[PDB]
Amino acid sequence: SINECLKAMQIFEQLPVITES
Amino acid sequence: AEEKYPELFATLANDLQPLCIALRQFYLENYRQLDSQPREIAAMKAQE
Amino acid sequence: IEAIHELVKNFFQRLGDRLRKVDCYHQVYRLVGNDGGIEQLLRRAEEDI
Asked: Where does this protein reside within or beyond the cell (chain C) (predicted)?
């Protein structure tokens, strides 16, 4: 949600987590 | 209204990364640590 | 031997703690989704040293 909120104006993305395996 | 305003959010994200970076690292280390241990009883019993 | 272990361990943890504040560490993490193996290589080098 934080990334989506900033997606509208700024491009500074955060670090997600996926496929820990 | 077009330069200083967006910068406030930009610095906010830059100040959030230093702590979000640590939480991810801590969880992965613990999560992958447990996966090393066996799951089946037969393997676990032999270890003892 | 006992004191040497402490010396090396303290140095590496201090190096890592201060390495996460410089731009170079989080610029890459900003650009990609993974650390790039810094911790894995750093841990391996520390043990070898």
From this structure: Membrane
CB-CB under 8 Å, B6 with A10: yes
The experimental method behind these coordinates is: cryo-EM
- Please tell me what resolution, in angstroms, this structure has: 3.6
First-last CA distance in chain A = 24
Region for A19 from its dihedrals, namely left if φ exceeds 0, alpha if ψ lies in -120 to 50, beta otherwise? left
Best of C20, C27, C30 to mutate (most A CBs within 10 Å, chain A): C30
* Core vs surface per residue B6-45: b (16+ CB within 10 A) or e: eeeeeeebeeebeebbeebeeeeeeeeeeeeeeeeeeeee
Interface B:C, Cβ pairs < 8 A: 12
How many angstroms separate the Cα of B38 from the Cα of each of A20, B9, B30, B41, B47?
Answer: 18, 46, 15, 8, 9
Q: How many residues belong to chain A?
A: 21
